[PDB]
Design a protein around this ligand. Structure first.
Ligand SMILES: [Mg+2]
Ligand SMILES: [Mg+2]
Ligand SMILES: [Mg+2]
Ligand SMILES: [Mg+2]
Ligand SMILES: [Mg+2]
Ligand SMILES: [Mg+2]
Length: 169
RNA sequence: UUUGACUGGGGCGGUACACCUGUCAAACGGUAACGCAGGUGUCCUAAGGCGAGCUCAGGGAGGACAGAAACCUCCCGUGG
């Protein structure tokens, strides 16, 4: 019926903790993200200097990491369990991606540690079909055709099919 | 003994006094007014040299606190 190469999959899961300042909190936030995924994350600096937010330019204010494959699949399940497998209809972008936030990281089955603290984090899911890497390869770089593109509706349906989730208006 | 020069008289003023960009300038080049709009006496151990990878400004959509503005992601983006 459907081509096997049109199957939607998790291209990557992007986890971001924007602490907003450099020092104890960012270092501890990195440990939260590191032990949630097993991957050492990277520090994002501030592009501007905003007086309201108390951030200067070239100051590490956030910690983020990218996970792929089965490890990204199972972390995503923990996130939807916390969200009770339901998302608002507006959580889906027009490019076939969606995301959600977690207020407390220990809701993801992570033991709390007093010397670390409690943290929130941001989950962004990038979907895709086989062949999306042509836009990323160095040689013969190509742009995906219009039909391959994942529309907002086909991302919402995939969420309903896989995690039997709920879409709220 | 000296107490510059240019200058729509000289003085005051300015530097058109050594230079650079665009124009004037009349499609080679050259071309003047104390013509017009500006800049220079610096700065850099990299902002020099090579190589490698990468793509920018901006905009759209989306994502806990996060909002016009913090960070993450996708998309458009001939250089804006
Ligand atoms: Mg740090
Ligand atoms: Mg004279
Ligand atoms: Mg001379
Ligand atoms: Mg000429
Ligand atoms: Mg001529
Ligand atoms: Mg000429």
């Amino acid at each position: 019926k459907e081509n096997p190469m049109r199957e939607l999959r998790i291209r990557k899961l992007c986890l971001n903790i924007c602490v907003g300042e450099s020092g104890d909190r960012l270092t501890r936030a990195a440990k939260v993200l590191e032990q949630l995924t097993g991957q050492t994350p990277v520090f994002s600096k501030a592009r501007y200097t905003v007086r309201s937010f108390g951030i200067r330019r070239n100051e590490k204010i956030a910690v983020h990491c990218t996970v792929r494959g089965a490890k990204a699949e199972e972390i995503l399940e923990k996130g939807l369990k916390v969200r009770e497998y339901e998302l608002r209809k507006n959580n889906f972008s027009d490019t076939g991606n969606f995301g959600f936030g977690i207020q407390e990281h220990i809701d993801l089955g992570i033991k709390y540690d007093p010397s670390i603290g409690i943290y929130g984090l941001d989950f962004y899911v990038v979907l895709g079909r086989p062949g999306f890497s042509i836009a990323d390869k160095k040689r013969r770089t190509g742009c995906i055709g219009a039909k391959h593109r994942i529309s907002k509706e086909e991302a919402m349906r995939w969420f309903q099919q896989k995690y039997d989730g709920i879409i709220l208006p």
